A paper describes a structure:
To gain further insight into how the presence of a 2′-OH substituent on the ribonucleoside donor influences substrate recognition and subsequent catalytic steps, structural studies were conducted on the wildtype LlNDT-2 and a double mutant Y7F/D72N. These two mutations were chosen based on the enhanced acceptance of a ribonucleoside donor in an enzymatic transglycosylation reaction by an analogous double mutant of a type I NDT derived from Trypanosoma brucei (TbNDT). To explore the structural implications of the differences between the two enzymes, WT-LlNDT-2 and the Y7F/D72N mutant were both crystallised using conditions determined for the WT-LlNDT-2 enzyme previously. Complexes were obtained by soaking cytidine 8 into the crystals. All structures contained two molecules in the asymmetric unit, constituting one third of the hexamer routinely observed in solution. In the case of WT-LlNDT-2, electron density in the omit maps obtained could be clearly modelled as the ribosylated intermediate, and the cleaved cytosine nucleobase, whereas in the Y7F/D72N structure cytidine 8 was intact, presumably reflective of its poorer kcat as observed for CtNDT. However, the side chain of N72, which, like that of D72 in the WT-LlNDT-2, forms an interaction with the O2 of cytosine, has different rotamer conformations in each monomer in the asymmetric unit, one of which permits two interactions with cytidine. In addition, in the Y7F/D72N structure, the interactions between the nucleobase of 8 and the side chain of Q46 are slightly different, with the interaction between the nitrogen of the amide and the O2 of 8 observed in the WT complex disrupted by a movement of the Q46 side chain. The interaction between E98 and the 2′-OH alone would militate against the activity of E98 as a nucleophile for attack at C1′ of the substrate; additionally, the even lower activity of the Y7F/D72N mutant versus the WT-LlNDT-2 for ribonucleosides would be compromised by the removal of the interaction between the phenol of Y7 and E98, which may suppress the ionisation of E98 for nucleophilic attack at C1.
A major challenge in the further development of nucleoside analogues for therapeutic applications is access to scalable and environmentally sustainable synthetic strategies. This study uses the type II nucleoside 2′-deoxyribosyltransferase from Lactobacillus leichmannii (LlNDT-2) to prepare a suite of ribonucleoside analogues using naturally-occurring uridine and cytidine sugar donors. An enzymatic alternative to the use of NPs to prepare ribonucleoside analogues is to use nucleoside 2′-deoxyribosyltransferases (NDTs). These enzymes catalyse the formation of nucleoside analogues via an overall nucleobase exchange much akin to NPs. However, NDTs are mechanistically distinct, forming a covalent adduct within the active site, thus controlling stereoselective nucleophilic attack of the incoming nucleobase on the β face.
Numbering used by the authors:
A (entry chain B), B (entry chain A), C (entry chain A), D (entry chain B), E (entry chain A), F (entry chain B): 1 to 157
Write the structure that this text describes.
Amino acid sequence: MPKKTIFFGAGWFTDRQNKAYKEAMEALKENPTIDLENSYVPLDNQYKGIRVDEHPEYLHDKVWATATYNNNLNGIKTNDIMLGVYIPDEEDVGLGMELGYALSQGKYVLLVIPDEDYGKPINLMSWGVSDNVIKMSQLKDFNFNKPRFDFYEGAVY
Amino acid sequence: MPKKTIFFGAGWFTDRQNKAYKEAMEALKENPTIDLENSYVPLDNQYKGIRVDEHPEYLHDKVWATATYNNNLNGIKTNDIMLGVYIPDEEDVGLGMELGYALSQGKYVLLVIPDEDYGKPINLMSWGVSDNVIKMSQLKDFNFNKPRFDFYEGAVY
Amino acid sequence: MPKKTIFFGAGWFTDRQNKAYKEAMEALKENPTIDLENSYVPLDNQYKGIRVDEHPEYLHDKVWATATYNNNLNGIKTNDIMLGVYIPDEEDVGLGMELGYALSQGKYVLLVIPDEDYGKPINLMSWGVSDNVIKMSQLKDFNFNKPRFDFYEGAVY
Amino acid sequence: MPKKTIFFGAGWFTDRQNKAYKEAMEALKENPTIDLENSYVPLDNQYKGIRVDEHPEYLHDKVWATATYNNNLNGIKTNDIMLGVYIPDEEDVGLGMELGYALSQGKYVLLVIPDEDYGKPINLMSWGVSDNVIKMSQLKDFNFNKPRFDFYEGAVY
Amino acid sequence: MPKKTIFFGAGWFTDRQNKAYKEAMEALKENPTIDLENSYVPLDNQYKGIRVDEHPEYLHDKVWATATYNNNLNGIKTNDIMLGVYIPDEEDVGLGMELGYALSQGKYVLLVIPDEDYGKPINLMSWGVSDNVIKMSQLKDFNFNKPRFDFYEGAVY
Amino acid sequence: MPKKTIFFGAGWFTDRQNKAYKEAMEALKENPTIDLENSYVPLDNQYKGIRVDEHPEYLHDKVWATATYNNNLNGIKTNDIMLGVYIPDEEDVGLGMELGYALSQGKYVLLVIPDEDYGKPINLMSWGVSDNVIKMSQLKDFNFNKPRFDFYEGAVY
Ligand SMILES: Nc1ccn([C@@H]2O[C@H](CO)[C@@H](O)[C@H]2O)c(=O)n1
Ligand SMILES: Nc1ccn([C@@H]2O[C@H](CO)[C@@H](O)[C@H]2O)c(=O)n1
Ligand SMILES: Nc1ccn([C@@H]2O[C@H](CO)[C@@H](O)[C@H]2O)c(=O)n1
Ligand SMILES: Nc1ccn([C@@H]2O[C@H](CO)[C@@H](O)[C@H]2O)c(=O)n1
Ligand SMILES: Nc1ccn([C@@H]2O[C@H](CO)[C@@H](O)[C@H]2O)c(=O)n1
Ligand SMILES: Nc1ccn([C@@H]2O[C@H](CO)[C@@H](O)[C@H]2O)c(=O)n1
């Protein structure tokens, strides 16, 4: 079984983000076509250790920001597949940027939406960058070695 | 006097977005380095001239979506400069994607924030993709012939 | 009145190609949004000014080929708009490659088909790379300052 | 033995295409550096099942075309190597486009020509996009882990 | 008379670099196809207006470096043509990187070599990235509206 | 243990280059995350055999140069990681070009500097293209499966 690495695109601000985060991570743990160990998970890759939760003064530090921004781009460009954990009611400008970067870097762009949310409207441009969008319950068995193009069965605005 | 064209990146989904939209458009009309006539305004380039909020029968039309998505990419790639009307409290996933696309197309990426909001934290990834960020009241006089890189006078989250 | 430059993508290997070539060139001469003088015409930019059909000693010259190939890429990348004079029944692999290159360089990709052939099926991949396709008789009046995406009024095979 | 995946670029219209198709497929089956299972073969990836042979009404469907076009680009961008089964007498605009896309996506671009045809003239731009061109009989033993640049020993037009 | 802008690629780290710098700048002032006013000159675009050789406190400032690096990339991407003032005996790693970046941004890459040095061997990779190379005394009259590919009249090492 | 391939970017002119070359090669031989066998080493990939050491007439041959230039680009684009063996006192325009190419091709760009030299000033643009710069003694244990962004702890000019 060949395995692909992913960039774990996902917010961690809100309760719905955190729930979807935990679920997507569990699905990837079960997916035999994913090498999670060698995948890039932003939350586990805080520059120089420094946790911004505990030291918010770093949010005005240009060096911290440059390094964190660059680490994210690096994580996208050096991994096989771009994953976007996507909450239709809580769409994220940062994830959006990353989707557009991933597109430019020639990566497959997979959005994953919670089953309870699948079908709800998403932004045209999110709809368009995506090569495919699936429900959370399909993530554990998605074949990342044979990724295909498909359309969201759902609304755009 | 050389003139550049822009892509008008902006949400139109809240009252603060719409207010910023109207102000930015007025500033561009007054800027002697911008050719607004030959610029791309997404809201005037929707497929078949139809907005999905005014004709919700198009919410699941895949042809309308494909064409509108593609028209936007074309608007970014064929114009000189990428503009992002940006509300820190109401950031737009669609604009984010477009910032990433613009970066891929080698365009200058200028964010413009209402004066009342300038200085407030913005998303890391918006901070990073952007080449520069200014107050709404600076847009009318910005020299688009000599565009330069600068850091936002403001924090990220 | 702003003017754009074009790369003149066109075969010259059949009578219908050559007829379309001559017509497209005449239309461009009359289009007030085109600067034809500073446009790239492949047939005037062959290495050492020599065409391989008139001097078949060059059929295996690797230097002539490298230079002519590279001159074409340079012609696409340094001009505003990619034009493809396109015969549905006599499609050209060389033009196809160039359509792909132009896409990579972020150029508007306009196919122009003789009126007598407009509406006939074209290759899927030509249909997709193209931003738009028009009849020969529309080329003289096309506004290259406001280029937009549209679907071919026609089938694919 | 590391293995690479390919996109199987090849027409299936004519008798010469079909013969070369069958031969190239057999060679890849024998090549220990190719993972054919996880490679993208357009003919086995018809969108939503729908075979256009049996339902030609889909050739005027914009959604079918968008999806099929995108599936092909996706198959090129997500695989390691671009293969072009190339018939000098029957050159294909669609394959051409794909070669240019593959180039832009940073892939090795390998043309394979039937032994009976190797040496016959090919288009300059096909000659140029290619990183290498080989005879059909060399495909089964080509080392895809150590791909090199070389010139076609043959004519261009 | 159409005018193009340039990025002024040049070292300033030896006497021969500086002499070539001054000569190239004078030639550009006289070239009727160049808009020098709206061109990017790296030495006038250092972050905070400070040169590290005049203020060595900035030798380890990561913010100064990030901004100056980014300003240069922006200068290449937003101007029409990439110029490289090139000393065969004193080749510059920084300019080299920029040649590669310019290639990525689809810009014409023109090297200009002092007359006294024109014809001397240059690095293979400089020879290859360049679209063309000329003598300093040709820069004042070069037609930047019709830029073409040519091989250096000179060797590589 | 997954393994990545590299392009071995390094000069071989001077005594310091040759020493660093030998050391970097030995470190890669010891690194379990590198597949050196399938990596691209320019010095072992002389076109058509022809060694330029022994036949310097090839330095004025345009075909030799085209092929060697292209083989290098091909070696960068088809491998996972770009390595630059970097001597601060002897910076190389060719390596510079390759770094910029690698960046454009979405590769991780790792500079490696001799321990005796680590901390010495390097060009701004080398500092910027790099995703990371390490000392020679860290190369044997660098985890190429989890590459990260970091800043040189050293001077720029
Ligand atoms: N402080 C921050 C803010 C944003 N991010 C990146 O941006 C996405 C969420 O906006 C996430 O996918 C994440 O990669 C980050 O890493 N750190
Ligand atoms: N229905 C829609 C939705 C989005 N957009 C594009 O995306 C941004 C707004 O999210 C805008 O910047 C716009 O380009 C659009 O054009 N039409
Ligand atoms: N001998 C040749 C052959 C091809 N071409 C380029 O490719 C297209 C014609 O196939 C044309 O669009 C042209 O750019 C060329 O320039 N010279
Ligand atoms: N109806 C069609 C037409 C074309 N193609 C793609 O284009 C190439 C042949 O033109 C082939 O390589 C194939 O990928 C396709 O998939 N379906
Ligand atoms: N301190 C520095 C060092 C380098 N540069 C850029 O890189 C080239 C000179 O190496 C120049 O072409 C210039 O663009 C710079 O701008 N500032
Ligand atoms: N004659 C030459 C000259 C240069 N090179 C490539 O350029 C880098 C050193 O300049 C090296 O990294 C090497 O790839 C080459 O291969 N052959």
